[PDB]
Swiss-Prot record:
Assembly mode: Interacts with USH1C and USH1G. antiparallel heterodimer with PCDH15. Isoform C1: Interacts with CAMSAP3; leading to inhibit CAMSAP3 ability to induce microtubule bundle formation.
Annotated glycan sites: N27, N83, N128, N145
Residues of the whole record sequence present: 668 to 884 of 3354
Role this protein plays: Cadherins are calcium-dependent cell adhesion proteins. They preferentially interact with themselves in a homophilic manner in connecting cells. CDH23 is required for establishing and/or maintaining the proper organization of the stereocilia bundle of hair cells in the cochlea and the vestibule during late embryonic/early postnatal development. It is part of the functional network formed by USH1C, USH1G, CDH23 and MYO7A that mediates mechanotransduction in cochlear hair cells. Required for normal hearing.
Name this polypeptide is given: Cadherin-23
Tissues expressing this chain: In adult animals relatively high levels of expression are found in testis, skeletal muscle, heart, eye and thymus, and lower expression in kidney, lung and brain. Found in the sensory hair cells of the inner ear.
UniProt subcellular location: Cell membrane
Record remark: domains: Three calcium ions are usually bound at the interface of each cadherin domain and rigidify the connections, imparting a strong curvature to the full-length ectodomain.
Domain Cadherin, first and last residues per copy: 5-102, 97-202
Lineage of origin: Eukaryota, Metazoa, Chordata, Craniata, Vertebrata
Naturally occurring in which organism (per UniProt): Mus musculus (Mouse)
Reported disease: Defects in Cdh23 are the cause of waltzer (v) phenotype. Waltzer mice are characterized by deafness and vestibular dysfunction due to degeneration of the neuroepithelium within the inner ear.
Gene: Cdh23
Length: 202
């Protein structure tokens, strides 16, 4: 009544595993003909018990599969589950959420005043989905919490009556770029501008 080495099988592959690639090898005994049910993404070779992908997978669509595998020869069936888990691979860029950002700010607003919060999103997992945010070029007027996106003013004040054009530019435009922390790291297509409309206290 032909049965497998184990009743239940646990396997891990990577979301970029190729079309056709071997997932797992199964042998049952007490000849023997094998069949696999539970996703069309997977097929099992009927003589040899080799499970393979039929297609490309994607953990962001489906991270875990359960397949059911049957061995038959007065024939008798035997059943084992196979429990495929896809390991995340860093294959999505972050995407800016509500960019660009248009804001109105009172000049000489004091140290540590709220300005905005930039937000991006990454559908990958763990380090690959973790977002880190940076102001370029180095902006002396604004400080940004690299993990949370929140932007605040600095101990340097915002003075509209400042004659350096570049410092005025810095005051009135903030450019954030965002990465994620997998290897390779991936950045959002483009940076994201906060546009700042400076207002006196008339
Ligand atoms: Ca992924
Ligand atoms: Ca990513
Ligand atoms: Na993907």
């Amino acid at each position: 009544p032909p049965t497998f080495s184990k009743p239940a099988y646990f396997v891990s592959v990577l979301e970029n595993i190729m079309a056709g690639a071997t997932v797992l090898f199964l042998n049952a005994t007490d000849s023997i003909i094998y069949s696999l049910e539970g996703s069309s993404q997977f097929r099992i070779n009927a003589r040899s018990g080799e499970i393979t992908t039929t297609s490309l997978l994607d953990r962001e669509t489906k991270s875990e599969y359960i397949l059911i595998v049957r061995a038959v020869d007065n024939q008798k069936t035997g059943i084992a589950t196979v429990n495929v888990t896809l390991l995340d691979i860093n294959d999505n860029h972050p995407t800016w959420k509500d960019a660009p950002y248009y804001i109105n700010l009172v000049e000489m607003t004091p140290p540590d005043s709220d300005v905005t919060t930039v937000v991006a999103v990454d559908p990958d997992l763990g380090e690959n989905g973790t977002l880190v945010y940076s102001i370029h070029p180095p902006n002396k007027f604004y400080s940004l919490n690299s993990t949370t996106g929140k932007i605040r003013t600095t101990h340097v004040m915002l003075d509209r009556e400042n004659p350096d054009p570049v410092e005025a530019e810095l005051m009135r435009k903030i450019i954030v770029s965002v990465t994620d922390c997998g290897r390779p790291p991936l950045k959002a297509t483009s940076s994201a501008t906060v546009f700042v409309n400076l207002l006196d206290l008339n």
